[PDB]
Every structure is written in structure tokens, then in C-alpha cells.
């Protein structure tokens, strides 16, 4: 455990509305304060009912079926609470409660789903947000030149590792240390 | 009107839980892409019931009573919907729909209340977030030296947030 470590997280959901939609995937990963990847946490397909999956709009059915996530959700024996507790069992080994901001890309949406469906995991984070896309937005406005230099190869944890590498790029090319 | 303008916003709430708590203040302000303040929007006390105000924990009762916001809430004839529409009437003059990220300090909480209580104003923002406190967090971890150089009413908070982002632009970003 170290109080400067960062919790990175990436959810998949059935849609964008926490009131109607559910979490169907959680992945976590911990870095040190300098973005050295310490440990990859468990990628868990979160079981939801056939009823709930049938409410998915066409974009979500297409994406989550093609990826194999829909199959893994149907087969999963872990609901919201089991996935929450397994994620906490992983994070407790690496980061104390209330210290890491929520880190990732478009993490405001993810935190909304944590508040509704995994409030204990939500509480484990510092109140603050580290959305890498905050730096992409500023870069696009103040220094667009640097955006040509970074590329994504287009898997939850591939997205997290890409988010870490993206923050590291902004640390070298956008920040002044 | 200009596609590169930024919407800055600060809500006050009765508490932290959108399921139980309500918006009691909205303030907005628009900057250009380089943080030049173009216009201060309306600061509106959002009417909520005496029942709802009575659910406030000690921190919220102390803060919102002392500021005079509780008096203004009781006197207000603008609910969620009227405050939403008045805010949109101001923002339409300055920024097209779907262009500005939500800008401010600890703004994820505010957006949660927009989703529940002002979904039309929420939709007016780009899906993205510009939380200045994201840069404060990185600064604290990567360059704490610069935090001693900067030191800190809804709109005072927003103007302070703009000045804070401007500080990080000079002392933390490399242009
Ligand atoms: Mg994502
Ligand atoms: Mg505030
Ligand atoms: Na928290």
C-alpha cells in the first residue's frame, strides 16, 4: 500500500443512463504517482438479466455482442455486489481508501454508475477526478500540434493501459516539470 | 456566439446525493478558448420546499444560512425548470449547443445534479469535463512547488477557478 498510487478504472454499461442501464464490465489497474503500472486488477463481466440486456439500443447490442461481452455477462455468476467486493479486494492491496482520484478516460460517466450500483467502491476513491481527456481537451485548444504524435490501436484493459500511456505523453509534451 | 467559448458553472446543493438532495443555486460564466471572461451569467437561488431545506446536514445549514442563500431560496419563485431555462437563455447568446465541456472546480458532482434535475442544460454541454482540480491533483503529485504561488459566493468561486486554470496555463503547461 502507498498513498500516492493511482486507481485507473474502465466500466462497460448497457447504455448511458444509470437510472435504466447497468454495469456489465469492470476493469481496474494501479500505477504509482509517476504512471509506472504496479498491477492489473481483475476484468469482470458483471451478470445482468436477459430482460436488462434486451433493453440495450442497437449500438450497445452490436458492440457488446461482437466483443464477446454479452456471452460473458450471461455466463457470469458475479452481480454488481460481487464485482464491487472483488475489485475492492484487489485495490486494498495497493492503495489506501480516500487517496486516489478516479483515473481513466471519460470517467465522469463511470463514477455515475459507481454511485448508483457500487457505492462502496465509489467511496474508496478520493472525491476528485483525473480524466486524461481533460488534458486532451486543453491540448486541442492550446497546443493541437502534440495530438498528431499520439495514436491508439483501437478490450477494457488495453483501453486503460492506452489511457495511462496518453497521460504519460501529456506529461512529456504538454506539462512543464 | 463562437464554437470555442467555454461554459463555467457552479451549483450549490442541499447535500451530495442527487437521489435525496436538490439544487439551491446555479451560477454560470462564459470565457473564450483563452480564458478571457466574456460575460457573467445569472446567479439564481433555486426555490426548494422548507421540507427539503430541513434535510440539510449541519455543514450545509451553516454554509447556506451564513451566505444568505437559504433566505434567497425561500423567497425564490424559480424552481429547477425556471432556473434551467434562464441559464439556457444566457448560454444561447455565447456558445452553441454540444460544444463546451462543463468547466469549473469539482464539476463531476455538479453534472450529476444537472443530469437528474436540469437534463436540458446538461445536454447543452459537450460530454467532456474540464475540471481545473484535475490539474491541481497532477501539480500536487508532479510539481507541488507551484501550489504555494496560488491562494484562494458562487461567482467568486467560478472567477477563482478561471484564474486557477490560467495559473496552471502559465506555470504547469508548456506552450
Ligand atoms: Mg470507457
Ligand atoms: Mg461550489
Ligand atoms: Na469518494
- Between CA A85 and CA A117, with CA A23 as vertex, the angle to 5 degrees is 55
* Contacts of residue A95, Cβ cutoff 8 Å, sequence gap at least 6: A1, A2, A3, A5, A6, A7, A30
SS3 content of chain A, % helix, strand, coil (to 5): 45, 15, 35
* The 3-state secondary structure of chain B, one letter per residue: CCCCCEEEEEEEECCCCCCCCCEEEEEEEEECCCCCEEEECCCEECCCCHHHHHCCCHHHHHHHHHCCHHHHHHHCCCCHHHHHHHHHHHHCCCCCCCCCCEEECCCHHHHHHHHHHCHHHHHHCCCCEEEHHHHHHHHHHHCHHHHHCCCCCHHHHHHHHHHHHHHHHHHCECC
Residue A121 φ then ψ, to 5°: -65, -40
Q: Which of A106, A109, A134 sits opposite B134 (nearest CB)?
A: A134
Query: Is some CB atom of chain B closer than 8 A to the CB atom of A149?
Result: no
If phi > 0 it is left, if psi is from -120 to 50 it is alpha, else beta; for residue B112 that is alpha
Q: Ligand 3 centroid vs B133 CA: distance in angstroms?
A: 15
Find residue B39's DSSP bridge partners: B30
The CA distances from residue A63 to A66, A67, A155, B135, B160, in Å, are 5, 6, 11, 33, 42
Check if CATH label 3.40.1410.10 holds for domain A6-174. Answer: no
In angstroms, what is the span from residue A142 Cα to ligand 3's centroid? Answer: 31
Disruptive mutation site among A141, A143, A146, A168 for chain B (greatest number of B CBs within 10 Å): A141
Considering only CB atoms, which chain A residues are within 8 Å of B131? 128-129, 131, 134
- Judged by CB atoms closer than 8 Å, whether chains meet at B129 and A130 is answered as no
DSSP bridge pairs for B130: B103
Beta pairing partners, B9:
B28
Give the distance between the most distant pair of CA atoms in chain B.
51
DSSP string, A26-74: EEEEEE-TT--EEEE---EEPP--HHHHHT--HHHHHHHHHTTHHHHHH
CA A61 to chain centroid: 20
CA distance B91 to B95: 6
A129 is catalytic: no
Homologous superfamily of B6-172: Ribonuclease H-like superfamily/Ribonuclease H (3.30.420.10)
Technique that determined the structure: X-ray
SS3 A9: strand
3-state DSSP call for residue A137? helix
Amino acid at each position: 500500500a502507498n498513498e500516492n498510487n493511482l486507481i485507473w478504472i474502465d466500466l462497460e454499461m448497457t447504455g448511458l443512463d444509470p437510472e435504466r442501464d447497468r454495469i456489465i464490465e469492470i476493469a481496474t489497474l494501479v500505477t504509482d504517482a509517476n504512471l509506472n503500472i504496479l498491477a492489473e486488477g481483475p476484468t469482470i463481466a458483471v451478470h445482468q438479466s436477459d430482460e436488462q440486456l434486451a433493453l440495450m439500443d442497437d449500438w450497445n447490442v452490436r458492440t457488446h455482442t461482437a466483443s464477446g461481452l454479452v456471452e460473458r455477462v450471461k455466463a457470469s455468476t458475479m452481480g454488481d455486489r460481487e464485482a464491487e467486493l472483488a475489485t475492492l479486494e484487489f485495490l486494498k492491496q495497493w492503495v489506501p481508501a480516500g487517496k486516489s482520484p478516479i483515473c481513466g478516460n471519460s470517467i465522469g460517466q463511470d463514477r455515475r454508475f459507481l454511485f448508483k450500483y457500487m457505492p462502496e467502491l465509489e467511496a474508496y476513491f478520493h472525491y476528485r477526478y483525473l480524466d486524461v481527456s481533460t488534458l486532451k481537451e486543453l491540448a486541442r485548444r492550446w497546443k493541437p500540434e502534440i495530438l498528431d504524435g499520439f495514436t491508439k490501436q483501437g478490450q477494457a484493459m488495453d483501453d486503460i493501459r492506452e489511457s495511462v500511456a496518453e497521460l504519460a505523453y501529456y506529461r512529456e509534451h504538454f506539462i512543464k516539470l
